[PDB]
Symmetry: C2
Subunit: 186 residues, 2 copies
Amino acid sequence: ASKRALVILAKGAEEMETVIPVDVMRRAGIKVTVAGLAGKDPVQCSRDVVICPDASLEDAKKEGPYDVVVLPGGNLGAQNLSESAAVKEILKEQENRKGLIAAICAGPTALLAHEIGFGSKVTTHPLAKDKMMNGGHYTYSENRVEKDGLILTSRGPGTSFKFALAIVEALNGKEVAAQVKAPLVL
Amino acid sequence: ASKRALVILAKGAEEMETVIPVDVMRRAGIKVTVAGLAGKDPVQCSRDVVICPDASLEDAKKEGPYDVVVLPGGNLGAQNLSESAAVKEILKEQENRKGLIAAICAGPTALLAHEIGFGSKVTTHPLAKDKMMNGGHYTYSENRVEKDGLILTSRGPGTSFKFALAIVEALNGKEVAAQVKAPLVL
C-alpha cells in the first residue's frame, strides 16, 4: 500500500513551498494530490508561477483520508487557507484521526485560524511569528523543522527540502528519506 | 531598467529546478519569461507538476534578447531542449552577444548538444557527467555552482537556490543577491 498526501494549493501560495514537497514526496513513492482550494482552475502563485492542480479541493476531500495534509506558505496563500471552511473541516478531521499535518512558512497560521494543534511546539517564517503567536496558543521554535507529534512545521523556502524530507521520514521511514535525499545533491 | 530572463520549459523538466530559479529571480526584480518549448500549453514536469508557461518559446524568442537564458534539468526535459532547433538558435545567439547562459542538473547537456561554450569548466548532476563529457569538450567540476565566464552551471535540486542566487549576483550584483537570500531562510 502507498501513503497518500493532500497538498492544498491556494492563490498566493509560495510556489517553491508547493513544488518542493510535491516533488520530493512523489520521489518517495507517496501518492500526492495537488488540490486547488478554489477548484480545478490554474493557480497563480506568489511569484506568478501558474500551477494546474490535479483536482479541486472539493473533489479531493471526498477521496481521503490522507496520511498527511500539507499547507504551503506564502502570506496570501496562507490567508486563503485560513479563511476556508473546507480547509477547517479537513484539518479537524485529520487531527481527530491522528493524521499528520505539515505546514511551512506562513502556512502554520492556518492552523491557528482553524484552532488546530493548540499546545504544540511550532515554527514559522520569522515574519509570521507574531501572527502565529497571537493568544499564546503554541510554543515557538526557531528550528528549521519542528515536529510535535502530528504537527510538523517549518520556516521558509530554504527549509523546504528539510520539511519535505521530514514528511517522507514520518510516512515512509528514515531509510526512504535517506535514499530520496542523495540524488537531490543537498 | 530591469534585467530579463528566459526560462525554457520542456516536458519532463525538473519542476524544482524550474520554479526555484523563476521565483528567486522575480524576488530579485528580474523580468522572467517562462517559455514553453512546445507552445503555450501546460507542461507536465518530471514529477507530474503541471506548469502553465507565460508564453510559447516561439513568441518569447521574438522578444529578446535576454540577459540570461536558463535551462532547467530533468533528464527528459534536457533531452527535449537538446533536440530543439529553436533552443540551438537562442543559445548560439546568446553566446555570440556574450550573454549569460545558466543550466542546472542534466540541463548542461543541451549545451553539449548545441555546441555551446566548449572549453568551459562545467558541472552537472553526477549522473549526467558522462553524457556531458562525451568528447572531452568541457572540463568537469564537482562544485555545487560553477561559473566560467558566461556559462553558469549547477548540479541538482538541492543546489537550485545557490544556482538561482548566482544568476541574481551575475545580473544584479552581490548586494541584491544577499538581500534576496535573507528572507528565504537558507
